Subunit: 27 residues, 3 copies
């Protein structure tokens, strides 16, 4: 399987539950 | 040249060495 | 609408702005 691209808002995302979550949420 | 989808267990993954690595492992 | 694969040099990347950023940059 392959994931879909993450938003381009200059924010970092992590790949969780098929979605892009802000890395900062893990910070 | 895209990456494959990460697990959907509610965990966050980072993209390293062609694999999904638990973000929490980096925290 | 998927993202392209990150480097396979054992470094973890975060998805931000259509690019792979090192997770350690967030650590």
């Amino acid at each position: 399987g392959y994931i879909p691209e993450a938003p381009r808002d200059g924010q970092a995302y992590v790949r969780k539950d098929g979605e892009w979550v802000l890395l900062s949420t893990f910070l």
